[PDB]
């Protein structure tokens, strides 16, 4: 049910990939932040 905005890796910093209502939120690691690892800390 609802999965495919993580078909192309579309977070960063082997960020995870989340499936949401409106999008998907990637879940980075600590030594990253933002919806998609953009802020490498």
């Known amino acids: ?3 495919d ?4 890796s579309p977070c960063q ?3 995870s990939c989340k ?6 939120i990637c879940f980075c690691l600590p030594a990253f932040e ?3 690892c953009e ?3």
Do not use: I, W
């Not at 905005?5 to 192309?8: D, G, I, L, R």
């Open 1 to 3: 049910s609802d999965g």
């Open 5 to 8: 905005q993580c078909a192309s």
């Open 13 to 15: 910093n082997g960020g």
């Open 19 to 24: 499936d949401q209502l409106q999008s998907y």
């Open 34 to 36: 933002g919806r998609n």
């Open 39 to 41: 802020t490498h800390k």
